[PDB]
């Protein structure tokens, strides 16, 4: 727990000596490595670390104890987790114009990295994911089963950032090869606010990689063989709590302070298919609904505090507190379905602490 | 080799097959396919397709046969760098501010799309790669290894274009500068760094950002379905001659850039303004004189036609085509000298074939 927070250097540095052994002059492996080496700290670095925790936590309470060699095997998948984090940042905060992401800024905005960057970073980030679990488990019999889990966590996690980007475009309400002059002026579709479009969203971006994952590759590394019953149980778990951990997050982007997040809300004005969105759309009046069409998703301050007013008004604060309750029940409830004492605990503490 | 690009549907839909089982609602599913079938359709098709042909081939004349199976597995191998290649393009074009690609819109300029969606979109196509090997070679023993050389292959390419995008950047000359994290404000105005302008640090680049994709990774993958077990010397050969092949090929896009014919490339030229070390510009600057190199620090770099104007006319006066053509001799010659110390007759076969029809392709 502390013990993961001291492996990192290992497992970068592991990587970083892989791009060192390339063929290149000296004086051009001495740059790469300085990019580099600020590339994993900047982004890797200053979070809470819950996905990484997780992994440990699940491989030590399915086994029963643990050498030093299998740490180092488990930290590498907690280290692989958080590079994924990482990376699902970098391009987020590019995807969502970001202007600060834990606390400090958006890695895209550094005049000396730029967009063009960003986007070579991002890619070389997921496939560095690859390399150390080569290093650490080529010769492990679950060795091709972790990096499939990688790779379909991964996809399905692009295909909710492409709902999350698109759910209310033109595209969804034949695409035009012929248009690059005439842009999309962003607007709220009706027909695409409800919790069914919603929950598809937040399961694929967020419940694959940021619960189904990190538990599903302890449960590999302990050797719970793929067949077993209880992966679909854990599937149907994670659901649950991406649905609970997603809108938590949305209603931090009003609600929360950004000192604490790290990060400044946008959902509003980058016109996101969100929680609040959609309860407040579910209980308001039909002319509040005409001014919520009119005010969502502009780059605008009177706007935006249209939008504001509204979640306070429908008293947005207390149907969350009031979700966040039967959710929490609804995912105990299904924690205790798993009969299995040691993978049980570790995902009711997760609960405890996942804020 | 036509019967390459009749089994491209196949590749295609297997994946988005896989994509219509996730659990999402019907009308969902349905604008999914819509888009990913575009996006693969737009992007993979239309090109030479010598990367994917290199596999057929090299898997064809290692061997002596193959059953229809066999093909298939390879074939897949064939389309999954198409797709990679269709992936690097994708971002390349965001990369270099492309404005044409295969004599169409760059896919990240389209309204529909636009840069968010063409990001995410490439780290989909890439994926997808892996997908598509696994339905089709989980069972092979050569799997783990397929893998692993599409992995470092990326690995390599995407170093090279780091070095492609930075080489000449404040990053790389001040160098003893860290990177300024508190800076969002102060865009660096882009200029060449002499000391960079040198064929050693221009091999570096293109080695990484071609040689590997381009040449080893089609090579390597047919030898390693064929059977070929990774510890033949041979491989080591392979690599030494793909290095050649890229450098020989990257070379040749650089003349493109500034020789070449839009309506037959397919693309826009831009190095110039992009201020990218090219090959143009190392000849001009090891040949040129004193004021003429300063002419090109003040003119090299800059999206301004007047400034390109001055290094397009430098590279007439110092008449860069005349020694494109004189590399192009030695370079080739260079080339067919290692083919011909692999021992090998089918590969051997191979590789002249592709000596041949690189820059015309079929
Ligand atoms: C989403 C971010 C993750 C994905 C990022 C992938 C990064 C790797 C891109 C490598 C592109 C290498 N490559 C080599 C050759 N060119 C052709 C062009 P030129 O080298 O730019 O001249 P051309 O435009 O002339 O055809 C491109
Ligand atoms: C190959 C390079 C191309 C990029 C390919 C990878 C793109 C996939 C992006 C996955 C990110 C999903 N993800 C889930 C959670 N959030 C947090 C933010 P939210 O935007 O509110 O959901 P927040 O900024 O509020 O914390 C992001
Ligand atoms: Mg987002
Ligand atoms: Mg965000
Ligand atoms: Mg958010
Ligand atoms: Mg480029
Ligand atoms: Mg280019
Ligand atoms: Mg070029």
Redesign the interface.
Known sequence: LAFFRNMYDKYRDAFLS??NE????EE?K???S??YK?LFD?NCLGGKNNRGILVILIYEYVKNRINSSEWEKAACLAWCIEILQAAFLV?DD??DKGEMRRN??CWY?????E???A??D???L???I??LI?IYLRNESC??DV??TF??A???T??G???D??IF????S???????????QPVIDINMINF??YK?IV??KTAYYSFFLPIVCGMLLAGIAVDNLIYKKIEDISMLMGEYFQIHDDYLDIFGDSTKTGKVGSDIQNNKLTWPLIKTFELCSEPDKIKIVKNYGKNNLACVKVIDSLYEQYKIRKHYESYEKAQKAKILSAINELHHEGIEYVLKYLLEILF
């Not at 905005?109 to 990295?113: A, G, I, P, S, T």
């Not at 475009?169 to 969804?172: L, M, R, W």
């Not at 034949?174 to 999309?184: F, Q």
């Open positions: 892989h791009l390339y063929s290149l002059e051009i001495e740059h790469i300085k990019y600020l900047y391009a590019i995807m400090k800024y905005l550094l005049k000396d990295v967009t063009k960057n986007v070579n991002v890619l070389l997921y496939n560095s690859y390399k080569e060795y091709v990096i499939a790779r379909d991964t996809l399905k692009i295909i950032q492409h709902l980007t698109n475009s033109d595209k969804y034949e695409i035009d090869v012929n248009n690059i002059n005439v842009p999309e069914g479009v598809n399961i694929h």
